[PDB]
Amino acid sequence: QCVNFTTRTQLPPAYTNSFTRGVYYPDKVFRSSVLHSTQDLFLPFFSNVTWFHANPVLPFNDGVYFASTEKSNIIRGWIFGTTLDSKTQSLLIVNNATNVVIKVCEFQFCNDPFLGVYYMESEFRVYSSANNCTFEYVSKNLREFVFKNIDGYFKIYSKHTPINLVRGLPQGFSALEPLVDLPIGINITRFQTLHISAAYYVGYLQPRTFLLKYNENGTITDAVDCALDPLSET
Amino acid sequence: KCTLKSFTVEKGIYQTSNFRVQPTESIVRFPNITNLCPFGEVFNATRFASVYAWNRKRISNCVADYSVLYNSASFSTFKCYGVSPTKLNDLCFTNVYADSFVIRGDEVRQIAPGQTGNIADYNYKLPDDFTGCVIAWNSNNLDSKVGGNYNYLYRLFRKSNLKPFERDISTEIYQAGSTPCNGVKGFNCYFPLQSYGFQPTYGVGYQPYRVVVLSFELLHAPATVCGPKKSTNLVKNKCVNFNFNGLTGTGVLTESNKKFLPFQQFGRDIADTTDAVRDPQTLEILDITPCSFGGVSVITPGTNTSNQVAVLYQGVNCTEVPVYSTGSNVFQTRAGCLIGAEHVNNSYECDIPIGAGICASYQSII
Amino acid sequence: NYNYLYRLFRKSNLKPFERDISTEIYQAGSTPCNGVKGFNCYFPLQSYG
Ligand SMILES: *[C@@H]1O[C@H](CO)[C@@H](O[C@@H]2O[C@H](CO)[C@@H](O)[C@H](O)[C@H]2NC(C)=O)[C@H](O)[C@H]1NC(C)=O
Ligand SMILES: *[C@@H]1O[C@H](CO)[C@@H](O[C@@H]2O[C@H](CO)[C@@H](O)[C@H](O)[C@H]2NC(C)=O)[C@H](O)[C@H]1NC(C)=O
Numbered sequence: 188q189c190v191n192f193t194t195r196t197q198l199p200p201a202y203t204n205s206f207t208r209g210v211y212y213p214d215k216v217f218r219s220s221v222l223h224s225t226q227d228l229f230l231p232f233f234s235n236v237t238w239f240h241a242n243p244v245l246p247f248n249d250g251v252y253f254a255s256t257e258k259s260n261i262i263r264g265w266i267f268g269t270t271l272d273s274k275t276q277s278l279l280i281v282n283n284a285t286n287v288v289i290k291v292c293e294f295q296f297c298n299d300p301f302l303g304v305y306y307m308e309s310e311f312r313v314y315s316s317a318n319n320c321t322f323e324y325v326s327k328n329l330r331e332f333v334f335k336n337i338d339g340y341f342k343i344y345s346k347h348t349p350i351n352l353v354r355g356l357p358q359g360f361s362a363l364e365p366l367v368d369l370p371i372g373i374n375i376t377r378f379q380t381l382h383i384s385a386a387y388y389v390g391y392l393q394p395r396t397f398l399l400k401y402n403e404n405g406t407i408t409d410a411v412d413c414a415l416d417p418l419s420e421t
Numbered sequence: 422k423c424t425l426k427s428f429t430v431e432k433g434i435y436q437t438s439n440f441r442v443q444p445t446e447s448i449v450r451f452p453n454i455t456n457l458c459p460f461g462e463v464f465n466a467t468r469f470a471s472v473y474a475w476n477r478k479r480i481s482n483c484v485a486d487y488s489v490l491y492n493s494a495s496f497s498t499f500k501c502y503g504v505s506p507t508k509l510n511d512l513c514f515t516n517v518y519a520d521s522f523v524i525r526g527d528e529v530r531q532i533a534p535g536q537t538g539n540i541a542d543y544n545y546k547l548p549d550d551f552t553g554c555v556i557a558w559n560s561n562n563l564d565s566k567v568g569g570n571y572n573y574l575y576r577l578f579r580k581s582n583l584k585p586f587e588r589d590i591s592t593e594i595y596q597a598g599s600t601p602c603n604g605v606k607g608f609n610c611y612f613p614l615q616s617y618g619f620q621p622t623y624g625v626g627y628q629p630y631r632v633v634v635l636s637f638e639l640l641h642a643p644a645t646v647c648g649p650k651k652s653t654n655l656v657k658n659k660c661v662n663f664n665f666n667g668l669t670g671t672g673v674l675t676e677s678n679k680k681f682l683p684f685q686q687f688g689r690d691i692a693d694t695t696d697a698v699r700d701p702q703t704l705e706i707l708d709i710t711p712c713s714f715g716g717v718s719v720i721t722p723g724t725n726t727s728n729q730v731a732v733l734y735q736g737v738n739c740t741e742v743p744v745y746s747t748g749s750n751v752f753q754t755r756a757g758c759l760i761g762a763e764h765v766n767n768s769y770e771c772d773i774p775i776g777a778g779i780c781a782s783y784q785s786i787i
Numbered sequence: 788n789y790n791y792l793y794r795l796f797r798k799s800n801l802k803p804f805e806r807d808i809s810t811e812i813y814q815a816g817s818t819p820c821n822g823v824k825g826f827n828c829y830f831p832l833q834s835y836g
């Protein structure tokens with residue numbers, strides 16, 4: 188149940204700097220006050236971030252860093268897949284107050300996928316149909332997320348932080364804890380971002396090498412890019 | 422003598438072998454387990470569909486305890502074809518499929534690899550390579566009706582047979598002859614489906630029998646569906662072997678005060694050596710210490726002189742010695758545990774250096 | 788031909804070049820056999836079709 192829209196809002200994408208954000212815990216192994224070198228798919232430091240202020244379709248590539256600097260739980264929905272229709276197994280995610288809810292099958296979407304708020308909200312008109320599937324899973328502020336998919340396992344790493352800077356990303360460091368794991372394998376090439384009735388940043392990750400520092404409590408406090416510049420390589 | 426391959430030994434200290442404390446018992450502690458598959462709705466279902474309309478169910482991502490199914494004696498027929506039922510709780514595949522229906526008592530044997538029949542050719546056909554099990558049981562008191570239960574139908578007429586894992590519910594008027602029929606029965610046109618006449622008064626082999634066939638699937642997705650595991654009792658302060666959630670190894674387990682963030686499961690110190698684990702059941706941080714070991718050594722005054730020796734255990738506390746379990750007055754030193762040589766309070770020069778500033782000589786042995 | 792036989796159930800395995808000819812009921816399940824197969828007990832020998 189949906190129709191088209193006339194206010195075809197396409198604000199041109201701006202570009203900004205990533206600084207030192209987008210580090211997540213690689214392993215489930217506790218460590219204490221140690222420097223560990225690891226090769227993994229990370230967001231390279233001081234890279235280009237494609238700032239968005241309708242919603243296009245972006246390639247997923249290997250792994251995607253997604254950030255939303257919102258106020259009081261704005262961001263809700265995510266759509267992932269190769270064809271994003273009833274031809275190929277699609278994936279849908281809705282963030283909820285407690286946790287996230289995930290549906291894995293073929294939903295038929297229109298040009299304007301949106302949730303809708305009624306003024307207490309009750310409106311679910313993002314898609315139109317869903318024939319067959321099995322997998323369903325249920326469990327001011329910048330919310331960061333890292334989405335990855337490796338060998339039949341889709342992983343979502345989450346983080347919430349408070350900030351008062353208005354323009355861009357802050358100059359801070361915070362490791363991204365693992366939140367959700369999925370032992371499911373479906374082909375994904377593209378994804379979108381869902382509207383509600385708002386600026387967000389997107390970044391693309393590459394396989395590189397990093398050095399991490401663990402404090403006495405098993406938390407990451409500092410990271411160094413291996414192959415960025417001579418000092419960091421040393 | 423065996424080590425030196427000689428019948429005479431000169432005075433001195435010789436390394437012979439090593440002492441290692443053996444394990445005492447095995448402790449396995451797997452997590453709290455959950456997510457049992459819904460078998461109850463299968464074998465306690467209100468009603469099963471027709472044989473040619475056999476109900477298909479998929480089971481995935483849940484623990485499937487086959488012990489309760491196996492030990493139950495309420496099912497007349499329990500025939501597993503692919504593998505033995507006993508080991509099903511050990512090995513498992515990535516999916517399960519259940520085919521539930523009702524047949525006659527005589528048709529029970531028809532559902533097997535290398536079997537043919539009206540059901541096996543017009544209602545449900547299985548491959549000769551089929552692996553799994555079949556569970557059949559009489560339901561005369563339930564499915565059969567005193568007035569004749571015709572709710573169950575079976576395909577009787579069909580031009581061709583049924584392929585394996587194929588369900589057909591077509592109601593096409595079977596045309597045995599060459600005379601076409603426009604949906605109306607005639608001389609050479611009949612109904613392929615016939616209603617069963619299940620009744621309580623019917624004899625053995627005619628009563629309704631509910632049959633559910635279980636098969637196991639190996640799609641390239643990881644295996645997720647099989648029986649639960651076993652959890653032993655945790656012990657402490659004893660050199661034992663453990664299987665904590667797949668992390669297997671030996672050592673002595675004590676209590677630790679270290680802190681884990683709520684998402685790690687186990688830690689390590691350096692060089693990837695497991696040093697602390699959390700029990701997957703009560704969520705507390707334990708600690709692992711290697712079982713004590715160390716080479717043994719022999720101090721002798723020379724085969725020519727005498728024939729009594731002293732034994733040294735390197736870097737082992739004098740708490741666990743064990744024929745040399747008691748011997749003579751045991752002496753404890755920093756270098757290790759010394760057996761057979763009595764301690765004196767005097768001070769002479771050194772004959773056979775022992776370690777940590779202490780050493781022995783021949784008076785007996787001192 | 789039903790004159791040829793094979794063992795299918797046993798308590799454990801067998802040593803190399805070791806032949807076992809003990810023809811006894813096998814306690815397949817927890818139910819004791821007590822000389823009768825009944826349930827959880829079956830004859831561990833079978834022929835070839
Ligand atoms: C590591 O975690 C421990 C356990 O909480 C911290 O120790 C206490 O932490 C609380 C809250 O974080 C503080 O209110 C206490 O003052 C801390 N006490 C001590 C003695 O540290 C500890 O601060 C954390 N960080 C480090 C580096 O140990
Ligand atoms: C169908 O219902 C019966 C009766 O409730 C179940 O039999 C019980 O199974 C549990 C399994 O843990 C046992 O602990 C009980 O002792 C059983 N009771 C009786 C009277 O047999 C049966 O398990 C159900 N079917 C399935 C497939 O679960």
Ligand SMILES: *[C@@H]1O[C@H](CO)[C@@H](O[C@@H]2O[C@H](CO)[C@@H](O)[C@H](O)[C@H]2NC(C)=O)[C@H](O)[C@H]1NC(C)=O
Nearest residue numbers: 450451452453454455652653700701702703704
């Ligand atoms: C598995 O979960 C059960 C949930 O009940 C745990 O049982 C509780 O354990 C706590 C901590 O020891 C007790 O305070 C409760 O009284 C227990 N409730 C019961 C037994 O109903 C259990 O500890 C968990 N771990 C296992 C079983 O290994």
Ligand SMILES: *[C@@H]1O[C@H](CO)[C@@H](O[C@@H]2O[C@H](CO)[C@@H](O)[C@H](O)[C@H]2NC(C)=O)[C@H](O)[C@H]1NC(C)=O
Nearest residue numbers: 713736737738739740741753754755756757758
């Ligand atoms: C050898 O083992 C004995 C135990 O029989 C140790 O003595 C104990 O040591 C602990 C730790 O220092 C103390 O808390 C106990 O009070 C001691 N008990 C007794 C009876 O002495 C001894 O320390 C161990 N020696 C070595 C070198 O490891």
Ligand SMILES: *[C@@H]1O[C@H](CO)[C@@H](O)[C@H](O)[C@H]1NC(C)=O
Nearest residue numbers: 202203204205233234235236
């Ligand atoms: C990103 O690239 C654009 C051109 O493609 C450039 O104008 C901009 O300065 C770049 N930003 C960063 C942070 O590198």
Ligand SMILES: *[C@@H]1O[C@H](CO)[C@@H](O)[C@H](O)[C@H]1NC(C)=O
Nearest residue numbers: 260282283284285286308326
């Ligand atoms: C999150 O899910 C719970 C579980 O149904 C629900 O009670 C709660 O209202 C949800 N949060 C929302 C809708 O913001």
Ligand SMILES: *[C@@H]1O[C@H](CO)[C@@H](O)[C@H](O)[C@H]1NC(C)=O
Nearest residue numbers: 275276339371372373374375
């Ligand atoms: C992805 O597509 C390839 C070929 O296009 C196929 O072999 C593979 O099974 C697919 N993986 C999925 C659907 O998870």
Ligand SMILES: *[C@@H]1O[C@H](CO)[C@@H](O)[C@H](O)[C@H]1NC(C)=O
Nearest residue numbers: 429430431723724725726727
């Ligand atoms: C053994 O010791 C005695 C006394 O010192 C000596 O006479 C003899 O030669 C020794 N024999 C050997 C084989 O060392």
Ligand SMILES: *[C@@H]1O[C@H](CO)[C@@H](O)[C@H](O)[C@H]1NC(C)=O
Nearest residue numbers: 750763764765766767768787
């Ligand atoms: C050494 O001195 C201690 C101190 O009391 C005494 O108990 C022990 O018997 C003495 N041993 C010898 C061999 O003199």
